[PDB]
Homo-oligomer: A and B are copies of this chain.
Amino acid sequence: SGPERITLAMTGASGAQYGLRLLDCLVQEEREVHFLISKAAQLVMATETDVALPAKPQAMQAFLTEYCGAAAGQIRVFGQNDWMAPPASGSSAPNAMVICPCSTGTLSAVATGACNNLIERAADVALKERRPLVLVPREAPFSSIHLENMLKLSNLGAVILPAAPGFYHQPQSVEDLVDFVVARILNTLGIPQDM
């Protein structure tokens, strides 16, 4: 149930634990994850978390495999200019893509179709193939430029799922609020939530 392969992209918005928690749940659900991360997102993760993420893909692939307890080849990391990567072509891309968190800059590039890196190209491919594309922005306030880009992508089928956790399950910690959004993302993708 749900997509077997998911492209997980992390961009330079605040909330790196949303993406790390989502990656861990996708691994526990035994899904193949094509992991992409921007240069700004690597700076965010080093600023907000105690996760020492390696810079190059191969070292990053081995780190995240140990960090999540993933099986061999379950996590695949690709550089930001690796156009030969599966997510860059329609016939080879995973059946679903999540950008979590999604910076306002990546939200702008996906809305305009800039395709300046692998993350933006993979989102452009998901839209032209009409595959699930979930964007998780973190920004306050939302400008009209942010809202216009979100509305345009939402009108085209993309799911605008902001990092706005709810409080109606009486959260006790920061991780409870992170798990709220992550479960919302798995719910949108059609993947069970074994928290």
Give the B-binding residues of A (Cβ under 8 A).
12, 14-17, 40, 43-44, 47-48, 83, 90-91, 103-105, 107-109, 111-116, 120-121, 124, 127-130, 137-151, 154-157, 159-168, 170-174, 176-177, 181, 183-184, 187-188
A100 to chain B, nearest CB (A): 12
Chain B min CB distance to A50 (Å): 9
> Known contacts A144-B151, A144-B155: does B121 contact A113 (CB below 8 Å)?
no
- Select the residue from A83, A140, A163, A176 with max chain B CB neighbours within 10 A: A140
Within the complex, the shortest CB–CB distance from A64 to chain B, in Å, comes to 19
**CB-based contact B164/A145 at 8 Å:** no
Determine whether the beta carbon of A164 is less than 8 Å from that of B137: yes
Contact B113 A140 (CB under 8 A): no
Indicate how many identical chains form the complex.
8
A104 to B115, CA, bound (A): 7
Nearest 8 A/B pairs, CB to CB: A105-B115, A128-B143, A108-B113, A14-B166, A147-B151, A141-B161, A113-B145, A144-B154
State in angstroms the CA–CA spacing of A127 and B148 once bound together.
Answer: 13
Q: Can you give 23 A-B contacts (C-beta < 8 A)?
A: A12-B83, A48-B170, A90-B141, A91-B187, A105-B113, A105-B121, A107-B113, A112-B114, A114-B114, A127-B143, A127-B144, A128-B139, A130-B159, A139-B162, A141-B188, A142-B150, A143-B154, A147-B150, A164-B164, A173-B174, A174-B174, A174-B176, A174-B177
Inter-chain contacts of A176 with B (CB < 8 A): 174
Residues of B within 8 A of A156 (CB): 143-145, 155
